[PDB]
């Protein structure tokens, strides 16, 4: 993989402020726990502390913006649940070129009996189409699946 685009760095910077409620430039275990309980997750205080220590090798007690980039780097590692995502992607990506085009999604939708216009499909794709190419990239498909 190459280095992150200036655009990705900007995306992760806004995602950093989404995690950092103070805007002070740091994420603490309290803020980790704030996001966790907003997701309905109830781990122990010790688990939340170790989740900080996993990246806070420097020992200053917080996850700063470069460490947030490291926190994302440890999610760019293959995981078990990714197999289902890869299968679902290949159900829509019928020619296997690494992109789901609106036409390919429409093929599945037409077979389901959905009676949308191309413009209605376009609106659906727009929520995932970050780069504006009219298709869903693999990274964008993760974003598409993280929403509803």
Residues in contact with Ca ion by the rule CB under 5 A: 20, 22, 24, 26, 56, 58, 60, 93, 95, 97, 99, 129, 131, 133, 137
Cβ contact 31:63 at 8 Å = no
Binding region for Ca(2+)? 20, 22, 24, 26, 31, 56, 58, 60, 62, 67, 93, 95, 97, 99, 104, 129, 131, 133, 135, 140
With CA atoms as reference, report the closest residue to 30 among 63, 70, 68: 63
By C-beta, is 27 or 80 nearer to Ca ion? 27
The distance of closest approach from Cβ of residue 97 to Ca ion in the complex, given in angstroms and rounded to an integer, is: 4
Neighbours of 93 (CB within 10 A): 20
- Nearest residue to Ca ion, using CB? 22
Backbone φ, ψ for residue 62 (5° rounding): -135, 165
Q: Residues, the chain, total?
A: 148
By C-beta, is 25 or 43 nearer to Ca ion? 25
The distance of closest approach from Cβ of residue 80 to Ca ion in the complex, given in angstroms and rounded to an integer, is: 25
Residue 137: helix, strand or coil by DSSP?
Answer: strand
């Amino acid at each position: 993989a190459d280095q992150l685009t200036e655009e990705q760095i900007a995306e992760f910077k806004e995602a950093f402020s989404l995690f950092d409620k103070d805007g002070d430039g740091t994420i603490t275990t309290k803020e980790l726990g704030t996001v966790m309980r907003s997701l309905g997750q109830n781990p122990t205080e010790a688990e939340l502390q170790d989740m900080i220590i996993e990246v806070d090798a420097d020992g200053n007690g917080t996850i700063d913006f470069p460490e947030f980039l490291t926190m994302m780097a440890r999610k760019m590692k293959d995981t078990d649940s990714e197999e289902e995502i890869r299968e679902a992607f290949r159900v829509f990506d019928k020619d296997g070129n690494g992109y789901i085009s609106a036409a390919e999604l429409r093929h599945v939708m037409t077979n389901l009996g959905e009676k949308l216009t191309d413009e209605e499909v376009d609106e659906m794709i727009r929520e995932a189409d970050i780069d504006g190419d009219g298709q869903v990239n693999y990274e964008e498909f993760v974003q598409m699946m993280t929403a509803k």
